[PDB]
Amino acid sequence: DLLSCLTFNGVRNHTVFSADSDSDFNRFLHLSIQNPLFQNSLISKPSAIILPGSKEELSNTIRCIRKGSWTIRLRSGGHSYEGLSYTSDTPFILIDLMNLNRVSIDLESETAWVESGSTLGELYYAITESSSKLGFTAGWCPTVGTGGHISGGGFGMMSRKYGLAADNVVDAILIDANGAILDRQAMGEDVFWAIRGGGGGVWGAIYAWKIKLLPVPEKVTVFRVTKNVAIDEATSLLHKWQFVAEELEEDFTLSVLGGADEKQVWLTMLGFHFGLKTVAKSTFDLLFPELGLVEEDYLEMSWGESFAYLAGLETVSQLNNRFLKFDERAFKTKVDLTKEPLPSKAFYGLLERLSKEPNGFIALNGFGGQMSKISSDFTPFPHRSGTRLMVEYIVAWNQSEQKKKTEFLDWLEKVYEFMKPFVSKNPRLGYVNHIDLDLGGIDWGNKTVVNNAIEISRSWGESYFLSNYERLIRAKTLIDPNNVFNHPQSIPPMA
Ligand SMILES: *Cc1cc2c(nc3c(=O)[nH]c(=O)nc-3n2C[C@H](O)[C@H](O)[C@H](O)COP(=O)(O)OP(=O)(O)OC[C@H]2O[C@@H](n3cnc4c(N)ncnc43)[C@H](O)[C@@H]2O)c(*)c1C
Ligand SMILES: *[C@@H]1O[C@H](CO)[C@@H](O[C@@H]2O[C@H](CO)[C@@H](O[C@@H]3O[C@H](CO)[C@@H](O)[C@H](O)[C@@H]3O)[C@H](O)[C@H]2NC(C)=O)[C@H](O)[C@H]1NC(C)=O
Ligand SMILES: COc1cc2c(cc1O)[C@@H]1Cc3ccc(OC)c(O)c3CN1CC2
Ligand SMILES: *[C@@H]1O[C@H](CO)[C@@H](O)[C@H](O)[C@H]1NC(C)=O
Ligand SMILES: [Mg+2]
């Protein structure tokens, strides 16, 4: 039995499947499901849930599962857009990493070791508690897990200054298919490259990341201002925004959340400056006076405060609450990367479509800055110089709106089709943290498909990784030749 192996090896925190609706099993299962779309009774459920409390327990958990016929599923923060950390078409064991949430800050080296169950919020909180002059570049959502996020890159409000989370990883502990405990030196440079953006659930189980902490001023300046406007003005704002955003010096970021409802358009402008408010306002007065920002819009605060504020949290303390409900809605999302400026009519049509579906919203980010100075092959995320914007389309709904699911998904499909001519093409680019199964998927139990796995997987592989796809395959073959870590879009090993 799996349990007997786990016990012989000192892993005690485990719970087998139970039909009891409010069993402990179900409590643990649902605790970290961050997309309600995959919560219902018709979804696949794990045969057991294991909560390892140490790297040794993680190693032995993997070793035991292998003595059986199980598919391994790793979950850190549970934010997978496609629920790939807690679903599987084959019988599976869920390894939940929530107990591995220790952050160890070394102020003498200005680095940190971060267990992979730690959320972004927990990490940010730990950093701000330790120092007023250090921060880290990662995503905007505080409940996202470092396990999946850093594995896939990790883009956020300081990426124009410092790049992705993965661009600032200097060591890691990877537990491989045989339970080996491997640091950077042990896994080798190809594998250490692959894990820094090559996607979660593919290489082994990351136990911990070693990150370089980055300088921040004791006071940064942010704004969070929602413009309530009509479509003509919203269109001209977004059309100018794209140029301001990509062209801003690296010490500034201007991003947008947007939506609409008939004649009313809302654009939430999210601003960040690595410095004081005089310089911040001088810059936006010059470059984007159309925003109509006023002195009272600019707030000076600590870096930690700024990340809580930009995400709409009440306090810095809230960063440290991994179970704080950030957004309890089922959702589907798609993303585009661009290479050419978007014409005005693209924003106009996007806004028209938003006005017809108030449950939809967009998130807009400029690249440029440091993102253009990092080589396309420095880490697996290839969208560097030449990449102008990242454009996210989201539709989300609560339980009372479930009847409209098909309609919501149809709306999103049509938005993505509308944007096709304006965004990257040949191929249409994507981002592995924004995993999208519409691109297709591999059934690893299907021999004819597996025989041709490399060609088949190119569909999504090249969209996520472009020319880096080849090295990823070589790295996969080195570290997981038997494909113990797999999912519908995992990098294939060579046969
Ligand atoms: C829900 C959500 C996601 C967001 C949000 N904001 C983002 C942002 O501002 N920038 C971004 O770059 N991404 C943002 N995303 C998307 C997330 O980045 C991705 O959804 C992350 O991959 C999520 O990571 P995590 O929360 O850990 O999700 P899981 O579902 O647990 O795992 C994803 C994937 O990775 C594997 N995996 C988890 N843990 C490990 C370890 N330790 N080792 C190897 N592999 C691991 C899983 O098996 C799965 O395959 C904002 C919001 C609200
Ligand atoms: C396996 O891991 C789970 C998840 O961490 C463990 O459950 C957790 O146990 C801790 C310690 O008992 C709980 O801490 C306390 O919770 C109570 C409220 O219920 C509170 O009074 C204390 O101040 C503290 O918060 C924690 O709630 C709980 N977490 C969850 C989500 O259940 C569990 O102990 C482990 N199981 C085994 C067999 O080791
Ligand atoms: C399920 O509900 C949500 C889903 C998602 C987000 C927020 C939600 O509430 C965030 C919103 C957001 C805001 C600003 C960003 O850059 C500054 C950004 O990249 C994102 C990304 N997305 C990822 C999808
Ligand atoms: C394998 O996959 C192919 C292509 O998706 C499918 O047509 C076929 O039915 C599958 N074969 C088996 C035996 O499952
Ligand atoms: Mg009961």
Torsion angle of C-alpha atoms 88, 94, 398, 351, degrees rounded to 10? -60
Give the domain 101-218+302-325+427-495 fold. Answer: 3.30.465
The sign of the CA dihedral 432, 433, 439, 445 is positive
Which residue is closest in CA terms to ligand 4's atom 5?
449
Residues in the chain, total: 495
Q: Is 181 helix (H, G, I), strand (E, B) or coil?
A: strand
The residues, any chain, with a CB within 8 Å of residue 417's CB and separated by 6 or more, are none
Breaks (C-N over 2.5 A) in the chain follow: none
- Identify the bridge partners of residue 300 per DSSP, sorted by sequence position: 221
- Residue among 173, 174, 44, 120 nearest 310 (CA): 120
Domain with CATH 3.30.465.10 in the chain: 101-218+302-325+427-495
Q: What resolution (Å)? A: 1.5
The Å distance, Cα 443 to ligand 4 centre, comes to 8
Which atom of ligand 1 is found nearest the CA of 100? 42
Q: How far is CA 490 from CA 147, 296, 385, in A?
A: 16, 48, 26
Q: Hey, how many other C-beta atoms are within 10 angstroms of the C-beta on 455?
A: 10
Strands 299-301 and 389-397: unpaired
Beta strands in 203-305 (DSSP E): 205-212, 214-215, 220-229, 252-261, 264-273, 299-301
Query: Could you tell me the two tokens for 27?
Result: 């409590």
What was the experiment behind these coordinates?
A: X-ray
Q: Identify the bridge partners of residue 253 per DSSP, sorted by sequence position.
A: 272
> Where in the chain do CATH 3.40.462.20 domains reside?
219-301+326-426
As assigned by CATH, the class of the 219-301+326-426 domain is alpha beta
3-state helix, strand, coil in the chain (%, to 5): 40, 20, 40
CB 73 within 8 A of CB 28: no
Count Cβ atoms within 10 A of the Cβ of residue 478 and give its class: 0-12 exposed, 13-18 middle, 19 or more buried.
middle
- How many helices (H) does the chain have, and how many strands (E)? 16, 18
Show the tokens assigned to 163: 């790049």
Which ranges in the chain are annotated with CATH 3.30.43.10?
1-100
CA distance 385 to 441: 29
Does the Cβ of 99 fall within 6 Å of ligand 2?
Answer: yes
CA distance 19 to 12: 21
Residues 6+ apart with CB under 8 A from 82: 38, 435, 436, 437
Encoded amino acid at 111, one letter: T
Running DSSP on this structure, what letter comes out for residue 29? H
Degrees (nearest 5) of the Cα angle 285, 290, 295? 45
Burial 152-176 (b: 16+ CB within 10 A, else e): bbbbbbbbbbbbbbbbbbebbbbbb
- Residue 445 Cα: closest atom of ligand 4: 14
Class of domain 1-100: alpha beta
Closest protein CA for atom 35 of ligand 2: 13
What are 62's two structure tokens? 């993997």
DSSP bridge partners of 106: 111
Would you say the CB of residue 44 lies under 6 angstroms from ligand 2? no
